[PDB]
Enzyme design. Sequence first.
Site, PDB file in Angstrom:
ATOM      1  N   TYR A  36      32.213   0.838  61.407  1.00 48.79           N
ATOM      2  CA  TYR A  36      33.105   0.161  62.410  1.00 48.79           C
ATOM      3  C   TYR A  36      34.542   0.760  62.625  1.00 48.79           C
ATOM      4  CZ  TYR A  36      35.832  -3.107  59.264  1.00 48.79           C
ATOM      5  OH  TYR A  36      36.622  -3.705  58.324  1.00 48.79           O
ATOM      6  N   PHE A  46      43.799  -2.452  63.406  1.00 46.20           N
ATOM      7  CA  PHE A  46      43.851  -2.932  61.997  1.00 46.20           C
ATOM      8  C   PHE A  46      42.882  -2.193  61.009  1.00 46.20           C
ATOM      9  CE2 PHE A  46      41.245  -6.092  64.439  1.00 46.20           C
ATOM     10  CZ  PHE A  46      40.032  -6.039  63.767  1.00 46.20           C
ATOM     11  N   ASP A  47      41.692  -1.722  61.448  1.00 47.15           N
ATOM     12  CA  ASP A  47      40.772  -0.979  60.546  1.00 47.15           C
ATOM     13  C   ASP A  47      39.938   0.097  61.297  1.00 47.15           C
ATOM     14  OD1 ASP A  47      37.973  -0.969  58.540  1.00 47.15           O
ATOM     15  OD2 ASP A  47      39.992  -0.951  57.484  1.00 47.15           O
ATOM     16  N   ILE A  66      31.569 -11.799  60.692  1.00 46.87           N
ATOM     17  CA  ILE A  66      31.983 -12.679  61.793  1.00 46.87           C
ATOM     18  C   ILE A  66      30.744 -12.995  62.666  1.00 46.87           C
ATOM     19  CG2 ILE A  66      34.473 -12.268  61.743  1.00 46.87           C
ATOM     20  CD1 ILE A  66      34.199 -10.350  64.165  1.00 46.87           C
ATOM     21  N   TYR A  92      38.383 -14.661  63.637  1.00 45.94           N
ATOM     22  CA  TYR A  92      39.468 -15.280  62.770  1.00 45.94           C
ATOM     23  C   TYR A  92      40.133 -16.588  63.363  1.00 45.94           C
ATOM     24  CZ  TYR A  92      39.090 -10.332  61.173  1.00 45.94           C
ATOM     25  OH  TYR A  92      38.609  -9.094  60.840  1.00 45.94           O
ATOM     26  N   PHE A 109      35.898  -4.621  68.448  1.00 50.17           N
ATOM     27  CA  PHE A 109      35.308  -3.752  67.354  1.00 50.17           C
ATOM     28  C   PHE A 109      34.269  -2.746  67.941  1.00 50.17           C
ATOM     29  CE2 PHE A 109      36.373  -6.389  63.314  1.00 50.17           C
ATOM     30  CZ  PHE A 109      36.571  -7.618  63.936  1.00 50.17           C
TER      31      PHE A 109
END
Length: 118
Positions: A36, A46-47, A66, A92, A109
Amino acid sequence: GVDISPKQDEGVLKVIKREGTGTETPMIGDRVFVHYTGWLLDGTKFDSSLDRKDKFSFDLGKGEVIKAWDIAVATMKVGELCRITCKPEYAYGSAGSPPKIPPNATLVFEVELFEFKG
Protein backbone atom coordinates in the site's frame (compact mmCIF):
# COMPACT_ATOMS: atom_id res chain seq x y z
CA GLY A 1 -14.06 0.77 -11.25
CA VAL A 2 -16.97 0.28 -8.72
CA ASP A 3 -18.72 2.50 -6.09
CA ILE A 4 -20.92 2.01 -2.99
CA SER A 5 -21.50 5.39 -1.14
CA PRO A 6 -23.61 8.29 -2.89
CA LYS A 7 -26.27 5.47 -3.51
CA GLN A 8 -26.46 2.88 -0.56
CA ASP A 9 -24.05 4.78 1.97
CA GLU A 10 -21.05 2.24 2.31
CA GLY A 11 -18.21 4.95 2.27
CA VAL A 12 -16.12 4.12 -0.96
CA LEU A 13 -15.13 4.49 -4.70
CA LYS A 14 -12.46 1.74 -5.83
CA VAL A 15 -10.68 2.77 -9.13
CA ILE A 16 -9.31 0.00 -11.51
CA LYS A 17 -5.79 0.92 -12.86
CA ARG A 18 -4.05 -2.53 -13.30
CA GLU A 19 -7.09 -5.06 -13.81
CA GLY A 20 -6.43 -8.82 -13.04
CA THR A 21 -3.99 -11.66 -14.11
CA GLY A 22 -4.38 -15.03 -12.17
CA THR A 23 -7.63 -16.81 -11.14
CA GLU A 24 -10.47 -14.77 -9.46
CA THR A 25 -11.31 -12.35 -6.53
CA PRO A 26 -10.99 -13.34 -2.72
CA MET A 27 -13.68 -14.46 -0.10
CA ILE A 28 -14.72 -13.32 3.51
CA GLY A 29 -12.07 -14.73 5.98
CA ASP A 30 -9.21 -15.09 3.29
CA ARG A 31 -5.40 -14.59 3.96
CA VAL A 32 -4.14 -11.79 1.53
CA PHE A 33 -0.59 -10.34 0.65
CA VAL A 34 -0.84 -6.57 -0.30
CA HIS A 35 1.43 -3.52 -0.97
CA TYR A 36 0.00 0.00 0.00
CA THR A 37 0.59 3.80 -0.47
CA GLY A 38 -1.79 6.22 1.47
CA TRP A 39 -2.74 9.91 1.74
CA LEU A 40 -5.13 12.22 3.70
CA LEU A 41 -7.67 14.43 1.75
CA ASP A 42 -5.33 17.55 1.85
CA GLY A 43 -2.66 15.56 -0.34
CA THR A 44 -0.41 14.52 2.62
CA LYS A 45 1.24 11.03 2.35
CA PHE A 46 1.06 9.40 5.97
CA ASP A 47 2.41 5.93 4.75
CA SER A 48 4.15 4.20 1.81
CA SER A 49 5.17 0.47 2.33
CA LEU A 50 7.01 0.60 -1.14
CA ASP A 51 9.60 3.17 0.34
CA ARG A 52 9.90 1.53 3.91
CA LYS A 53 11.36 -1.81 2.35
CA ASP A 54 8.74 -4.43 3.59
CA LYS A 55 5.16 -5.15 2.39
CA PHE A 56 1.60 -5.18 4.01
CA SER A 57 -0.55 -8.39 4.76
CA PHE A 58 -3.88 -9.10 6.58
CA ASP A 59 -6.86 -11.64 6.73
CA LEU A 60 -10.23 -10.32 5.16
CA GLY A 61 -12.55 -9.42 8.22
CA LYS A 62 -10.42 -11.41 10.82
CA GLY A 63 -7.80 -9.22 12.74
CA GLU A 64 -8.91 -6.28 10.73
CA VAL A 65 -7.75 -3.32 8.85
CA ILE A 66 -10.33 -0.76 7.70
CA LYS A 67 -13.81 -1.46 6.24
CA ALA A 68 -12.77 0.40 2.99
CA TRP A 69 -9.96 -2.28 2.64
CA ASP A 70 -12.35 -5.27 3.35
CA ILE A 71 -14.86 -3.88 0.67
CA ALA A 72 -12.15 -3.04 -2.00
CA VAL A 73 -10.00 -6.29 -1.37
CA ALA A 74 -13.24 -8.50 -1.67
CA THR A 75 -13.71 -6.96 -5.26
CA MET A 76 -9.88 -7.24 -6.36
CA LYS A 77 -8.10 -9.88 -8.70
CA VAL A 78 -4.87 -12.01 -8.22
CA GLY A 79 -1.61 -9.98 -9.08
CA GLU A 80 -2.84 -6.47 -10.23
CA LEU A 81 -3.87 -3.01 -8.61
CA CYS A 82 -6.53 -0.39 -7.62
CA ARG A 83 -6.76 3.10 -5.88
CA ILE A 84 -9.15 3.34 -2.89
CA THR A 85 -11.07 6.71 -2.34
CA CYS A 86 -12.92 6.31 1.06
CA LYS A 87 -15.11 8.17 3.65
CA PRO A 88 -14.21 8.15 7.54
CA GLU A 89 -17.22 5.73 8.27
CA TYR A 90 -15.22 2.89 6.59
CA ALA A 91 -11.84 4.11 8.19
CA TYR A 92 -10.59 6.41 11.22
CA GLY A 93 -13.97 8.50 11.66
CA SER A 94 -15.11 6.91 15.04
CA ALA A 95 -11.89 7.89 17.07
CA GLY A 96 -9.00 9.24 14.73
CA SER A 97 -5.48 7.79 14.04
CA PRO A 98 -3.22 8.64 17.23
CA PRO A 99 -0.22 10.72 15.60
CA LYS A 100 -2.18 13.07 13.09
CA ILE A 101 -5.89 12.14 12.10
CA PRO A 102 -9.15 13.56 13.88
CA PRO A 103 -12.86 12.05 13.68
CA ASN A 104 -13.78 13.85 10.29
CA ALA A 105 -10.88 13.69 7.62
CA THR A 106 -11.42 11.70 4.28
CA LEU A 107 -8.71 9.14 2.96
CA VAL A 108 -6.89 7.90 -0.17
CA PHE A 109 -4.98 4.43 -0.44
CA GLU A 110 -3.30 2.99 -3.66
CA VAL A 111 -3.19 -0.77 -2.89
CA GLU A 112 -1.57 -3.63 -4.89
CA LEU A 113 -2.62 -7.32 -4.32
CA PHE A 114 -0.25 -10.24 -5.26
CA GLU A 115 -1.85 -13.56 -3.98
CA PHE A 116 -4.51 -14.76 -1.41
CA LYS A 117 -6.23 -18.26 -1.57
CA GLY A 118 -6.78 -20.16 -5.05
